Amino acid sequence: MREIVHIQAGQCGNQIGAKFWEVISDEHGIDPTGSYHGDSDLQLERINVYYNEATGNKYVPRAILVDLEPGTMDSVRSGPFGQIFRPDNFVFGQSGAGNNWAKGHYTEGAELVDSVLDVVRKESESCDCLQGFQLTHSLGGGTGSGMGTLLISKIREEYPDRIMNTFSVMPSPKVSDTVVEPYNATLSVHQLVENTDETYCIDNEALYDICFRTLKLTTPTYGDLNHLVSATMSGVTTCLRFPGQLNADLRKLAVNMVPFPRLHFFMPGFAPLTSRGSQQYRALTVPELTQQMFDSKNMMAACDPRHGRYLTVAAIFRGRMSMKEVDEQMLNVQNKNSSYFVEWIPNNVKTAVCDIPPRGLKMSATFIGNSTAIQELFKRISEQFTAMFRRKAFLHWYTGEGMDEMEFTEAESNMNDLVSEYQQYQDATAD
Amino acid sequence: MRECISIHVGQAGVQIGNACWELYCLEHGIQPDGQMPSDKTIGGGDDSFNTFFSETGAGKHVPRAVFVDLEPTVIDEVRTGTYRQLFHPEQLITGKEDAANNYARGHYTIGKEIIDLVLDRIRKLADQCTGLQGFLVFHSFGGGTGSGFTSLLMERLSVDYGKKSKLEFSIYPAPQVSTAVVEPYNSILTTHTTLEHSDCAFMVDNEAIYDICRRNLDIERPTYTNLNRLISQIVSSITASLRFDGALNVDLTEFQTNLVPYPRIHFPLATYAPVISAEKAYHEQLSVAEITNACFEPANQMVKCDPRHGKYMACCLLYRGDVVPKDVNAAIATIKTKRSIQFVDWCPTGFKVGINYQPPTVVPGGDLAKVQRAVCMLSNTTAIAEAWARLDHKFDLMYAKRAFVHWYVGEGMEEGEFSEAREDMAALEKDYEEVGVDSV
Amino acid sequence: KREHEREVIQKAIEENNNFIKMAKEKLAQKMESNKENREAHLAAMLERLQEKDKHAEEVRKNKELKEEA
Numbered sequence: 001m002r003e004i005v006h007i008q009a010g011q012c013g014n015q016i017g018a019k020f021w022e023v024i025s026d027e028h029g030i031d032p033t034g035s036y037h038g039d040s041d042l043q044l045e046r047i048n049v050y051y052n053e054a055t056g057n058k059y060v061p062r063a064i065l066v067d068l069e070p071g072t073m074d075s076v077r078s079g080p081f082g083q084i085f086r087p088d089n090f091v092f093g094q095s096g097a098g099n100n101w102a103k104g105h106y107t108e109g110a111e112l113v114d115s116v117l118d119v120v121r122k123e124s125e126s127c128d129c130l131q132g133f134q135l136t137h138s139l140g141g142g143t144g145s146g147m148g149t150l151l152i153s154k155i156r157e158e159y160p161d162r163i164m165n166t167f168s169v170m171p172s173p174k175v176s177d178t179v180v181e182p183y184n185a186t187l188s189v190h191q192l193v194e195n196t197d198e199t200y201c202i203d204n205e206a207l208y209d210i211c212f213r214t215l216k217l218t219t220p221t222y223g224d225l226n227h228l229v230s231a232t233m234s235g236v237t238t239c240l241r242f243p244g245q246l247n248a249d250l251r252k253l254a255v256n257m258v259p260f261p262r263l264h265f266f267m268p269g270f271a272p273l274t275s276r277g278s279q280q281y282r283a284l285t286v287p288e289l290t291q292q293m294f295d296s297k298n299m300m301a302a303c304d305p306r307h308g309r310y311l312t313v314a315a316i317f318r319g320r321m322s323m324k325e326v327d328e329q330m331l332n333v334q335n336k337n338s339s340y341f342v343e344w345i346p347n348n349v350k351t352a353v354c355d356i357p358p359r360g361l362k363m364s365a366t367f368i369g370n371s372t373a374i375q376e377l378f379k380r381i382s383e384q385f386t387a388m389f390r391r392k393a394f395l396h397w398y399t400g401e402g403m404d405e406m407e408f409t410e411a412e413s414n415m416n417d418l419v420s421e422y423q424q425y426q427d428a429t430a431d
Numbered sequence: 432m433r434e435c436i437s438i439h440v441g442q443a444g445v446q447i448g449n450a451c452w453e454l455y456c457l458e459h460g461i462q463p464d465g466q467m468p469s470d471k472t473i474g475g476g477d478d479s480f481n482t483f484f485s486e487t488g489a490g491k492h493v494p495r496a497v498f499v500d501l502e503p504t505v506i507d508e509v510r511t512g513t514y515r516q517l518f519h520p521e522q523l524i525t526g527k528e529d530a531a532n533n534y535a536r537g538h539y540t541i542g543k544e545i546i547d548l549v550l551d552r553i554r555k556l557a558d559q560c561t562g563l564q565g566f567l568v569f570h571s572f573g574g575g576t577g578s579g580f581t582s583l584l585m586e587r588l589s590v591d592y593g594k595k596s597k598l599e600f601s602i603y604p605a606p607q608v609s610t611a612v613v614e615p616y617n618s619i620l621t622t623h624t625t626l627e628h629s630d631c632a633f634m635v636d637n638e639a640i641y642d643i644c645r646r647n648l649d650i651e652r653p654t655y656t657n658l659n660r661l662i663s664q665i666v667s668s669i670t671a672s673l674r675f676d677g678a679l680n681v682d683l684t685e686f687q688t689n690l691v692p693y694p695r696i697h698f699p700l701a702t703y704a705p706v707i708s709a710e711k712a713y714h715e716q717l718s719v720a721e722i723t724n725a726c727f728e729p730a731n732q733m734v735k736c737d738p739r740h741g742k743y744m745a746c747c748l749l750y751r752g753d754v755v756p757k758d759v760n761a762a763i764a765t766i767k768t769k770r771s772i773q774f775v776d777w778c779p780t781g782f783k784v785g786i787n788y789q790p791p792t793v794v795p796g797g798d799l800a801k802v803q804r805a806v807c808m809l810s811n812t813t814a815i816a817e818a819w820a821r822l823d824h825k826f827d828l829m830y831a832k833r834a835f836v837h838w839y840v841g842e843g844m845e846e847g848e849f850s851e852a853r854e855d856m857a858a859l860e861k862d863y864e865e866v867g868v869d870s871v
Numbered sequence: 872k873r874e875h876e877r878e879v880i881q882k883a884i885e886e887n888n889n890f891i892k893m894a895k896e897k898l899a900q901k902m903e904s905n906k907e908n909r910e911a912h913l914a915a916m917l918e919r920l921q922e923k924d925k926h927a928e929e930v931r932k933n934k935e936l937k938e939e940a
């Protein structure tokens with residue numbers, strides 16, 4: 001295992017995908033032309049996990065860009081680092097998915113998926129030892145949600161022994177494009193429960209609240225939200241991209257984080273998140289990072305971990321700092337928060353330190369939690385779903401594509417089962 | 432004569448191997464290019480050091496060792512590092528994809544693809560021996576390769592070499608440096624599977640070594656490099672009798688006679704002294720009495736447990752350096768009249784002593800002071816079972832909910848294998864209770 | 872006494888051979904069972920995925936029949 005193949009689908013998927021590539025390219029010292037201009041050998045040691053190396057010492061993201069309309073991908077191509085992507089790796093239709101999961105999954109998306117699979121195969125066939133895949137998409141639209149989950153199923157068929165990882169952006173009425181987002185999300189979660197190994201729940205609700213409440217951005221834009229998302233995606237992939245001992249590949253991460261196969265939905269978190277004004281008063285230190293990363297306010301899913309229990313946790317620190325201090329602070333936080341870690345999985349919090357900090361910070365921390373409190377996210381979606389479904393609002397958009405109600409009922413039930421399962425393990429005891 | 436083949440499996444086994452072989456080269460005057468000026472027989476011989484090193488006609492002294500890992504990055508460092516010329520490339524064996532902290536992948540899914548090649552390479556070493564004594568196998572309990580591949584390899588070595596001796600140095604997990612939540616599953620699975628295939632196993636508790644580094648060497652946050660340098664001194668103490676001659680030298684196999692009273696009761700406790708920094712050792716000569724006393728201090732044990740709360744079935748003292756029997760006997764007499772040393776009623780109480788006169792060595796840039804004399808005690812104590820109890824309890828906590836078990840089942844294992852392994856561990860714990868009870 | 876000496880050594884040989892044979896057979900049984908188990912796990916997964924393809928066809932067929940209206 002070594003190479004990861006990245007896929008980004010739909011508007012949200014391509015927008016956060018592009019930022020992810022901008023951010024990590026900077027971290028690895030790769031410029032927009034794909035040339036290396038860094039100072040540390042750490043930047044190149046594991047560069048092939050994410051980049052192909054071409055002729056002329058060029059590094060090309062192992063990235064595939066997918067959409068059912070040309071607009072976003074055109075903007076990516078024109079954006080920063082837009083020329084870094086392999087032009088043949090842009091696969092797009094013209095008809096769009098109209099914010100309709102069914103069109104993405106069964107109709108328009110189905111017409112396009114084989115040409116996408118052709119590119120996946122070409123990337124995968126050239127891998128020395130393919131680890132698996134990471135997909136970026138929203139669950140609230142049509143393409144990322146419907147076609148993205150279609151792609152997942154088809155890829156799994158051809159690579160059944162490889163790890164499937166997603167960064168899945170959950171919809172929120174605070175940042176809302178359409179009224180059917182709860183339908184699209186529930187149908188999508190239905191797929192994710194069955195067909196991915198690990199999913200980062202990137203919640204627009206949480207991103208909005210961090211921007212508005214913490215960073216005091218009166219009118220957060222998608223740009224503001226995406227800055228947080230790329231900081232998080234940088235953080236949760238540092239163990240894969242830089243030399244290290246813990247969770248160094250997708251499968252070892254899954255083995256540490258997923259005790260039951262369906263419970264693979266992670267709450268990501270980032271520290272520090274303090275406004276410039278408050279930074280005047282509060283020092284950036286290891287204890288500050290540690291307390292912040294375990295606080296609800298720093299989570300990228302709108303769930304309070306103190307309303308549930310942790311099955312497993314990964315904590316990754318970045319920057320120059322005392323290993324002794326990190327260890328003491330991580331012991332301290334587990335002690336003070338003992339009740340909130342399940343007693344029947346011993347030593348379930350793992351800690352790593354990476355020497356290279358994010359751009360513009362002396363140090364940072366990234367949190368990955370598999371917490372039963374994630375049920376709060378799924379319940380929020382479920383409540384919005386049921387309100388619409390009990391009055392059959394807008395179903396004709398989906399039945400018009402050939403689906404029947406029963407499929408809605410099944411996705412609903414599977415997502416409600418997932419919630420009950422989190423609750424079961426939350427309530428379990430060693431005795 | 433009697434050759435010993437070392438097999439270093441997975442990251443821990445390999446990195447500990449690096450430290451051991453570097454230390455052996457320094458002890459024997461072998462350079463990084465494998466040349467040994469003091470050796471006047473070119474291309475072969477039957478010196479004591481030849482138990483661990485073969486020789487080529489061009490004067491290279493080559494470790495009798497295979498390094499194996501299921502991914503390449505740890506062994507790649509050996510291939511490109513300071514002692515790269517020491518090893519023939521075929522002795523360093525890697526796959527592309529590791530076992531992902533999963534015993535099942537190490538023993539079955541991935542391990543099975545490379546096991547025949549590894550055996551072929553081991554056979555090539557064995558064919559060069561005129562009187563092979565056995566194998567020394569270095570591995571973690573916690574890793575997927577260290578656990579699963581080691582087990583598979585031990586099973587296959589029993590088939591291909593019969594009852595030829597197989598000893599283990601096994602790295603027992605500690606939370607300060609562990610990298611997988613499932614290490615207790617892997618540990619129990621490999622301990623169960625290897626138990627009938629191993630003649631003697633020296634467990635090294637990473638937590639014990641971590642705290643010795645912190646406490647006795649003043650290391651704030653020990654790294655694997657710190658741990659492995661200490662571990663190598665201990666392994667060196669144990670193998671010194673195989674690699675050096677001497678009138679008072681006693682072979683490890685003779686200590687083993689006393690250490691293993693029943694086949695399953697084959698886990699000696701090692702305690703090593705002195706572990707001291709240069710700053711503290713300076714102008715301070717630690718005597719035979721002082722280092723011997725230190726062997727009965729639990730803080731110096733390589734496995735955390737309390738022998739004062741168990742019973743002894745054997746006590747062996749392996750001295751190296753400037754040590755004579757008169758001083759050993761005196762130190763032992765003092766200790767007898769002052770320590771919690773109770774034997775079972777069916778074993779003699781005399782301590783078994785060996786002395787190797789070659790003084791201890793240290794690697795440049797290390798943390799240990801260079802000392803004139805050192806000692807490793809190997810004891811067979813019922814207390815070592817506490818280590819199994821701790822692991823067994825962690826296993827039970829997770830297994831009761833079948834946490835993570837799907838990762839193993841997915842790779843073809845059955846729950847039946849988990850319960851069989853855990854029952855065998857419960858029987859081993861009971862075995863250790865039973866041997867300690869007085870005779871009727 | 873010579874007869875006994877012969878019996879002891881042939882006993883030693885027999886037990887060593889039996890130990891080898893048992894180890895060899897157990898390992899063969901384990902590797903076969905494991906192979907069968909993992910393959911069956913993979914087959915089940917692919918079977919589910921293939922059902923999904925079946926369902927997807929059904930959906931597109933259903934759309935086409937309702938557009939014949």
Ligand SMILES: *[C@H]1CC(=O)C/C(C)=C\C=C\C(=O)O[C@H]([C@H](O)NC(=O)/C=C\C=C\C)C/C(C)=C/[C@@H]2CC(=C)C[C@H](C1)O2
Nearest residue numbers: 227228230231234272273274275276279282283284358359
């Ligand atoms: C995005 C930079 C961007 O375009 C806007 C600029 C230039 C800076 C944004 C900084 C940022 O959002 O700062 C964050 C916190 O407010 N900072 C702190 O809390 C700092 C000190 C706290 C002391 C108690 C954190 C943040 C999300 C930084 C990320 C890191 C990263 C991966 C790149 C991204 C660049 O900034």
Ligand SMILES: Nc1nc2c(ncn2[C@@H]2O[C@H](COP(=O)(O)OP(=O)(O)OP(=O)(O)O)[C@@H](O)[C@H]2O)c(=O)[nH]1
Nearest residue numbers: 441442443446529530532571573574575576577608
């Ligand atoms: N003392 C010591 N322990 C180590 C070292 N490297 C890893 N460990 C320990 O070994 C266990 C992890 O197993 P590893 O040896 O790294 O894993 P592996 O055998 O390579 O197996 P996979 O990577 O799963 O294929 C943990 O308990 C680690 O703390 C080392 O160099 N020295």
Ligand SMILES: Nc1nc2c(ncn2[C@@H]2O[C@H](COP(=O)(O)OP(=O)(O)O)[C@@H](O)[C@H]2O)c(=O)[nH]1
Nearest residue numbers: 010011012015138140141142143144171175222
């Ligand atoms: N965080 C974030 N969310 C987005 C972005 N673009 C769209 N979304 C969200 O994605 C959902 C709409 O899906 P979208 O990706 O636009 O549909 P698609 O083009 O059919 O995949 C809504 O919940 C939006 O809030 C973005 O750039 N950042």
Ligand SMILES: N[C@@H](Cc1ccc(O)cc1)C(=O)O
Nearest residue numbers: 693694695696862863865866
């Ligand atoms: N009471 C038993 C103890 C024992 C322990 C472990 C064994 O494997 C066997 C026996 C005996 O001494 O005979």
Ligand SMILES: [Ca+2]
Nearest residue numbers: 470472475476
């Ligand atoms: Ca010679």
Ligand SMILES: [Mg+2]
Nearest residue numbers: 011012141177
């Ligand atoms: Mg949109």
Ligand SMILES: [Mg+2]
Nearest residue numbers: 441442529574
């Ligand atoms: Mg490894």
